[PDB]
Amino acid sequence: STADLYGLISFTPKRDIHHYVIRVDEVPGKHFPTNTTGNFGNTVDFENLEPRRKPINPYL
Amino acid sequence: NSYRAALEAGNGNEGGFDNKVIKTERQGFWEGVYRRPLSQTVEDLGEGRGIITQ
Amino acid sequence: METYELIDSDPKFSRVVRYFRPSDYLTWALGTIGAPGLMVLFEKIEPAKGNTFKMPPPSIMRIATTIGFFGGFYYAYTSSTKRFWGYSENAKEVAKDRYEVKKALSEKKSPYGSSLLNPYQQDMSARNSTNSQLLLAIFPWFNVANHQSHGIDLRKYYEVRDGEENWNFTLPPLDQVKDLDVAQYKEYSNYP
Amino acid sequence: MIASLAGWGLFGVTVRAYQQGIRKVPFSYYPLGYVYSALGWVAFGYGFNLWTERNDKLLEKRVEKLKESRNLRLS
Amino acid sequence: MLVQNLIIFNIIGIVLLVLLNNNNNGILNKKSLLTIKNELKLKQIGLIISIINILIIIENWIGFNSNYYGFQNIERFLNIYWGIDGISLLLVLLTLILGPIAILSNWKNLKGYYTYYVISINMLVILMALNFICLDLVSFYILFESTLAPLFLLIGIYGANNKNKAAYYVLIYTLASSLFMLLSIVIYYIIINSTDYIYINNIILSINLQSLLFIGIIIGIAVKTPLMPVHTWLPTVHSESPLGGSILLAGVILKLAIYGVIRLLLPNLSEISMMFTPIIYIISILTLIYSSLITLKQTDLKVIIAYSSISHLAVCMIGIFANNLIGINGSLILCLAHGFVSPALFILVGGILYDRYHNRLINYYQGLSTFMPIFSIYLVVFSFCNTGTPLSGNFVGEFLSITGAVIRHPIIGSLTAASVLLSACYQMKLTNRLTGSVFSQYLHITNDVTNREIFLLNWLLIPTIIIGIYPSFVTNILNLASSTLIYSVLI
Amino acid sequence: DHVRSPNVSFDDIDYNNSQDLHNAQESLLREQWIRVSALKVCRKALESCYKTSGPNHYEDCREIAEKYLNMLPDHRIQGFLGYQKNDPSK
Amino acid sequence: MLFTSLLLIIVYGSLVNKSHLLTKLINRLGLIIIIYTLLIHLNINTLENLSIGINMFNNLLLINSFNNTIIELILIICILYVLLISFNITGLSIIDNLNYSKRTFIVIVLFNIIGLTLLPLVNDIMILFIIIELQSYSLYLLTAIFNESHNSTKSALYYFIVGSIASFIILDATVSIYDDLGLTNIQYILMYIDKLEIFDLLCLLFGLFIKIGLAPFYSYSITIYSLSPTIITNYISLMPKLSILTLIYIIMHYINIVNNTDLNYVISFLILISMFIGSFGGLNVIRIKTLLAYSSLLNVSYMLLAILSNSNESIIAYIYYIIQYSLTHINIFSIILVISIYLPIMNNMLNVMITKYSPIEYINQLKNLFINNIFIAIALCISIFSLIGIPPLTGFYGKYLVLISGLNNGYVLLSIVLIIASSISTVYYATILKVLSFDTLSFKDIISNNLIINTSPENNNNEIKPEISNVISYVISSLTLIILLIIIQYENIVKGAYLVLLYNWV
Amino acid sequence: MDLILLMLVAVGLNIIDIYIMIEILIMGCTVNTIYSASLDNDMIGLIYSLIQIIIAGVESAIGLSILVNYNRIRNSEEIE
Ligand SMILES: CCCCCCCCCCCCCCCCCC(=O)OC[C@H](COP(=O)(O)OCCN)OC(=O)CCCCCCCCCCCCCCCCC
Ligand SMILES: CCCCCCCCCCCCCCCCCC(=O)OC[C@H](COP(=O)(O)OCCN)OC(=O)CCCCCCCCCCCCCCCCC
Ligand SMILES: CCCCCCCCCCCC(=O)OC[C@H](COP(=O)(O)OCC[N+](C)(C)C)OC(=O)CCCCCCCCCCC
Ligand SMILES: CCCCCCCCCCCC(=O)OC[C@H](COP(=O)(O)OCC[N+](C)(C)C)OC(=O)CCCCCCCCCCC
Ligand SMILES: CCCCCCCCCCCC(=O)OC[C@H](COP(=O)(O)OCC[N+](C)(C)C)OC(=O)CCCCCCCCCCC
């Protein structure tokens, strides 16, 4: 059991350019200090925003 | 060739060991096994001083 | 983990102080008088001068109380905040929060309150003060604005839980409450 | 837990005893320093065994998520 | 509860000896009863405790089964599993017996700080005893290097003129080498996730990874037991170290390496041991031949015995690496036999002659049988025991080790017989010179052997003869345990 | 009293169950000391036969000595690690 | 808690008169401020809720269970440090009045603590370049606190110049990253981790390598530490490494996303050289502070091997190592500050000049410590033995855990070198232990009333007057047994290291 | 011809000259930032430049304060 416990914890899951953790919990640019709608390039609509990527708390 | 890179490719010992699955092909550098073919021991240790004969 | 109900991810300064349990004031009471005591106890452990006990100057007993006062408040402030975030027991607080939010909606007033800040500044003041208590030890910062990024769904104040049917509250739909996102952009989508 | 707390309480006494050797005084000097040290290190003892007991509840729950991840690789 | 009783008792004993002595430092001059008669009331406490530790192992001995396979008295203390098997029982038993004799050897030849000396000896004895009763590579290492802290300070504080030179040698040779063993212990903890003996005994590694592990561990063994060409630290240490240090160093500490071969190499690196066994024989046999020729051209009294111990520890390594029960059993008996004769010689050479005439040059002494007849009697007897006389326990170890080598490799293992001739040359040439011709003109006639010095020799001689005449007291215990290490497939 | 040998061949067990693997190691050992004892009895006959026969010991002890030399090479402790860590079928 | 009361102390400091009694009591208020900060921090911060990582202050600062622990470590070491100035260390006024003259000593410490704790939490380059300056400036001011001294001022001028160069190197890398991507926040940059020039993060570390004194930049750290007063060197040689090694680990965590092979070789070149210089450097030195300065370089070298490997075993190794080396460093510098009372007095040869700033400066000033105070010497020997690595002291597990992470990632060369440099270094740690005890019996019969401690008058000659202060002796005793008796709680403590997470999760 | 470390020749041979070189070097990082902020039409980069100017200003004061105290130390005899 002591060996099996350490085998799980000491494992390092591979991270590359495809999978890694980014702690960005929203999308910027919904409100700007002035001239909120500029060149009309801000295509992302916050009324119909798809659900974001929630972090996975391992202790819960 | 490091253990971590070998482990992430399935060359490690993450899932434990078993002794019914006897691999004819030589194991990897970092791999461990419970039991090994006798022919591999004869190739390494050589026949003689207690291997096969006395 | 010992999670609970998430009352307010960004509790307001006035609401954090309001929800101080009687134990929380006791903590503040200890810290305000603990600091003068700790200075005394230090002289007991080893005197500053000589080899005999000598009470520190009365002037130091005044400044130490000030440090303890502004020090003991934060222990109370942090204790109350953990009840809002859901890190601490909040059965007492959930009852109080739901009653006030329901009272706010029933009177056709916003749960959060009127604000002097344009919609951007409310959003800006959310990011500056949210979770600031995790650094409250290092330096203070508080959520003193009436913004709306409290990370909740207001429909959770519509359904009636156990022991709430007696309050006889009537709640209008969200599109008719003053000072809300859904009930503000009725003419121009750029301006409230 | 009284079995564990007594251990720390003895450890606190030994620190006070070892302190006297540093200060070059007989070990029977001001015996209250042993009681104060024992109470102090019991207080750290109580807050330590909680920290270890609290860890066990955290570690096992994280373990469960780790065994599932291992089974995916072991497949 | 062996380990739990053993550590706690000594820790209690250390505090007792700390409290009684260091309470009187204060501001007052040391007018105290305890230090009256050279701290006689604080030496006696230390001598009692070393005797008591012998009684602890005996309590667990009567329950020990000589027929059950595996580790016995398996106990978990300090999150470490402790077990005793056939081999660990005799080495722990031997280690604890040398406890009292180490203290009693320096009973009245120290200039001061007897309380520090006593505690240092006990810590060395207990840590050595605990080293044979662990159950993982990590715990093996911890008790394999913790001894450096008391041993480095014991030699420096209570040493000879060149103690500074020797204090570095024991500290750095046993750390710059055992570190190379830490690498191999760590590799096991990475690829297997545990260093427990039983867990790693059943795992086979690749042909290359066994060689890398064998080299890392053989490096830490070839230094701990002096093996050529990294043997150049023990003779310096033995010359400078005090009598208590020299007794423990060549009595138990150098046998840890022989036991280290049993735990760390034979079961878990079994295949690669057969590949390295021809290499070990070339290294060991040349160690035997060179360390016996080098001893001929020596001058220092205590250095002469120091190189003698190296030769009789080369025979142990030759026997243990044999792949048969004959070689393994004799190698272990010889370690037990050499655990009494070698400490005895340091009592004669560096504990009786040096304690009276205060010199270590073989040119002064000769013809000591004229006015020191009792000293000569034990000089001749312990000389013939140290050479492999049939009635001694050395012969049983030396015959079986030589016979065990011949079975493994009849050609090169024949050279192991050189120990029969070579051990006679350098040893008797010392005994012939020390007890020959007219009494030396450089030495005044002094007291003969006293009661204390007689006692040690009589209680270091009797176990040697008892094992020699009837070694079945030892062989029967080892026969089951030693049979596990053997690796061979016969079809 | 006299506890027997739990006959367990390695090929029947899975080494993961540590209690089983201990049995297969102990069983292989305890069947190797019985062969050594049977060697001693066989050699205990050769000594008695040789002395009593006298000059006839080349004919009255011929089979006993022949069997002893035939059984000598493999009637000795071989250990379990040899057969545990090797599979002869491969 | 820090910001609110630091301003209170600043205003209160100049209002009261300049007297060493009022300054010392004000220093104690510094201790109370730090203690409250720890209670307030521990109350609101937990490992369970910080595992994900919680953004703060418009995503400028990001805190997770890894940076959180080091903040708790930084505060605790500072609490023990302030006990050196808030209480008597020796007792004699001549040597202790140096700690009470400067009123703004504690104020500067509290400025640095705010800088120390926030540095691991930086999540934007704009706030990185600021927070590094708030900590960096506090070091230069601290080194120059004793402006009457000639060596202390020249230390700060030398420290200011090199630290400014390191700041410019750090600034230049952040501007280079900004020029390629146009973004500031580190989490935004992580999106473009595959398209920015990865070596610009190495140029960022080269700035941070200078500040912790890594070879070939080791030259100035040894000079600075050997010159500043012992009360100052105890803080500037340990604290900057606590709050920068953590930041280096977080950046290395990001860099290993791409796993650049060229970047590891360059850093391994620095790690390899540091062990050489940190081991062979201290063989021929006479100053104790210069020796411990080389010891600091070698133990920084060992830790950086764990940081470079950067796997799940690195967190366990780095967390344990940084805690144990910090307590040991406090223990040794606490002892060296106390054993200054046994110095002999003349009544000449070599004209050796000893100043009140560094009463213990040469190793041979530790002679006969086994005779004068045996219990202290054993504490010093135990601390020295830990750095050597004698098991089962805390030092042994530090190297055992670093080797596990180092070998797990394939650092076979550096692991073998780390061991050789561990053996070479043992020579100049044994020298300290040789000085203390090796001549005990040849000097057991000595007549010597010429110690510094003998100057104090005899108060009663009946009551037992301890030679050392209560508080400072108790800290040495508490830390000595932690190092020696860690074997009991090691399995539980390492379990506490398993729970520390830096975006491991699953 | 920078890989031959030519800039070291261009530095003066006093401590005050070293201080100047550092400020020139830090000023190089601000001009690059203003170059990057303006072309991208970004005002976040211009905030960074404002901070660099302000922060590098404080570092100048602390350096000269140390140097002035250091220089006063040599001529600190004050016998009359
Ligand atoms: C059997 C087991 C034994 C275990 C140890 C075995 C290896 C031991 C190696 C020792 C061999 C060399 C030591 C003795 C040679 C004498 C060296 C010397 O004295 O310097 C000679 C030369 C200048 O000559 P001079 O100064 O006049 O000295 C004359 C002395 N007769 O000056 C020189 O040539 C110096 C050469 C330049 C230094 C190069 C250093 C490169 C690294 C060397 C290894 C250090 C460890 C590196 C890794 C750890 C640190 C990262
Ligand atoms: C009109 C032209 C004007 C040009 C202005 C500059 C003039 C030249 C000045 C000296 C130039 C030397 C450096 C050259 C550029 C730096 C190296 C480089 O970038 O690579 C170029 C060259 C070959 O690179 P290449 O293989 O072609 O890369 C193609 C990959 N697809 O890489 C090389 O192989 C160059 C050889 C370098 C190796 C030997 C020198 C290194 C050892 C001494 C270094 C000095 C001490 C430094 C110590 C470091 C401090 C720790
Ligand atoms: C009730 C529960 C709390 C326990 C108390 C904790 C603080 C101690 C204050 C007691 C009063 C005091 O310090 O009194 C002073 C005494 C004795 O001083 P002395 O060395 O003989 O000096 C001479 C004094 N004469 C002249 C009276 C003889 O010092 C002590 O006892 C020292 C004990 C060290 C502190 C132990 C706590 C460690 C906690 C560890 C957590 C990490
Ligand atoms: C002159 C004097 C010289 C010295 C003499 C020797 C004195 C011996 C004292 C024995 C004490 C004793 O018995 O302590 C026993 C107690 C009780 O153990 P538990 O809580 O059940 O833990 C279970 C332990 N298992 C699982 C191994 C059984 O543990 C302690 O207190 C631990 C001691 C403190 C360790 C130091 C680290 C803690 C802080 C972390 C900093 C990183
Ligand atoms: C088996 C488990 C043991 C664990 C407990 C160990 C307790 C250590 C002693 C503490 C008390 C002390 O330091 O006291 C000092 C004692 C006694 O000195 P003395 O000669 O009587 O003093 C007399 C002074 N006069 C003459 C002025 C009156 O000497 C020692 O240092 C001996 C033991 C420790 C030496 C090596 C320590 C390094 C250990 C490294 C990791 C193993």
Residue numbers in the entry:
A (entry chain h): 123 to 182
B (entry chain Y): 163 to 216
C (entry chain O): 1 to 192
D (entry chain d): 1 to 75
E (entry chain M): 1 to 491
F (entry chain p): 3 to 92
G (entry chain N): 1 to 347, 365 to 523
H (entry chain K): 1 to 80
What does the paper say about this structure?
Mitochondrial NADH [reduced form of NAD+ (nicotinamide adenine dinucleotide)]:ubiquinone oxidoreductase [complex I (CI)] is a large multisubunit enzyme located in the inner mitochondrial membrane where, together with the other electron transport chain complexes, it maintains the proton-motive force and the NADH/NAD+ redox balance that are required for adenosine 5′-triphosphate generation and a host of metabolic processes (1–3). The process catalyzed by CI comprises a redox reaction coupled to proton translocation across the inner mitochondrial membrane. In the hydrophilic domain, two electrons are passed from NADH to ubiquinone [typically ubiquinone-10 (Q10)] via a flavin mononucleotide (FMN) and an extended chain of iron-sulfur (FeS) clusters, forming ubiquinol, which is reoxidized to sustain the electron transport chain and reduce O2 to H2O. Here, we report the structure of isolated CI from the yeast Pichia pastoris (Pp-CI) and identify distinct closed and open states that resemble those of mammalian CI.
During analysis, it quickly became apparent that the sample was compositionally heterogeneous, with some particles lacking the FMN-containing flavoprotein subcomplex (NDUFV1 and NDUFV2, responsible for NADH oxidation) and some particles exhibiting an unexpected density that formed a bridge between the two major arms of the L-shaped enzyme. In contrast, the presence/absence of the flavoprotein appeared not to cause any other changes, so it is likely unstable and simply prone to dissociation during purification, reconstitution, and/or grid freezing. When NUQM is bound, the enzyme adopts the canonical closed resting state that has been observed in many structures of CI from both prokaryotes and eukaryotes, whereas when NUQM is absent, the enzyme adopts a more “open” resting state with an increased apparent angle between the hydrophilic and membrane domains. The open state of Pp-CI observed here is an intermediate-level open state, with two elements in the membrane domain (TMH3ND6 in its π-bulge conformation and Tyr156ND1 flipped out of the E-channel) and the region of disorder observed in THM1–2ND3 (that facilitates NEM labeling) in open-type conformations but retaining the intact Tyr141ND1 trigonal junction (with Cys52ND3 and His107NDUFS2) and closed-like loops conformations around the Q10-binding site. Last, as also observed in twisted D. melanogaster and the Open1 state observed recently in mammalian CI, the Q10-binding site of open-state Pp-CI remains sealed to the matrix. Direct correlation of structural data with functional data showed that only the open state of isolated Pp-CI is sensitive to NEM treatment, consistent with a disordered section in the TMH1–2ND3 loop that carries C52ND3.
